[PDB]
Amino acid sequence: NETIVIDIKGAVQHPGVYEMRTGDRVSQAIEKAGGTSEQADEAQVNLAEILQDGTVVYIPKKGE
Amino acid sequence: NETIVIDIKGAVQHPGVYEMRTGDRVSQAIEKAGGTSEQADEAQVNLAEILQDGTVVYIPKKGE
């Protein structure tokens, strides 16, 4: 199969575990998770990294 | 398939994640992102580097 699961913790509206398509990107996970939280610092996160399976996508908070 | 996705952080008008054609250039990403910000320093960035997939394109600010 060509589906994937991802753990989306950090500064997002609905952190949790989501199922993505095999070739998706971090920017898609954040959208899948409702969207970014108003305390997030996306500058140090690569939003076009290919999502690997059974991995974490942490969205840092400003000042971390 | 022959498309690509790119992270455009830095001094641009619309930073974010954009989809480029496989053989595009940094000068094209900047234009796709609305254009340079009025605080950008184009001297320290190579504007015809081949865009690689799932990578960041940081546009420094003057004085960085």
Residue numbers in the entry:
A (entry chain A), B (entry chain B): 59 to 122
Give sentences copied directly from the paper behind this entry.
ComEA, a DNA-binding protein widely conserved in transformable bacteria, is required for this uptake step. Following this contact with the tpilus, the movement of tDNA into the periplasm is driven by its interaction with the widely conserved periplasmic protein ComEA. We show that this domain drives ComEA oligomerization, and that oligomerization is required for genetic transformation.
To gain mechanistic insight into the function of ComEA, we cloned, overexpressed, purified, and determined the X-ray crystal structures of ComEABs and ComEAGs to 3.20 Å and 3.05 Å resolution, respectively. There are seven of these domains arranged head-to-tail in the ComEABs crystallographic asymmetric unit, and we named this region the oligomerization domain (OD). More specifically, in the ComEABs structure, the seven-membered asymmetric unit uses the OD multimerization interface to form a 14-membered head-to-tail ring around the crystallographic two-fold axis. We measured this in vivo by comparing B. subtilis transformation in strains containing wild-type ComEABs; ComEABs-D111N, which disrupts a conserved intermolecular salt-bridge between D111 and R83 (corresponding to ComEAGs Asp113 and Arg85); ComEABs-A106Y (corresponding to ComEAGs-A108Y), which sterically blocks OD multimerization; and ComEA-ΔOD, containing a deletion of the entire OD, while leaving intact both the transmembrane region and the DNA-binding domain. In comparison to wild-type ComEABs, ComEABs-D111N reduced B. subtilis transformation nearly 100-fold. Even more striking were the ComEABs-A106Y and ComEA-ΔOD mutations that reduced B. subtilis transformation about 1,000-fold, a phenotype equivalent to that of a complete comEA deletion. As shown in, the A106Y mutation prevents stable DNA association with competence-expressing cells, which we have shown previously required uptake to the periplasm. To begin to understand the importance of ComEA sidechain interactions to DNA binding and ComEA function, we mutated some of the corresponding interfacial residues in ComEABs (e.g., ComEABs K164 and K193) to alanine and tested their effect on transformation in B. subtilis. Western blot analysis showed that wild-type ComEABs and the ComEABs proteins containing mutations in the HhH motifs were expressed to similar levels. These in vivo studies also showed that the K164A and K199A mutations caused more than a 2-log decrease in transformation, in contrast to the reproducible 2-4-fold effects of K193A and K197A.
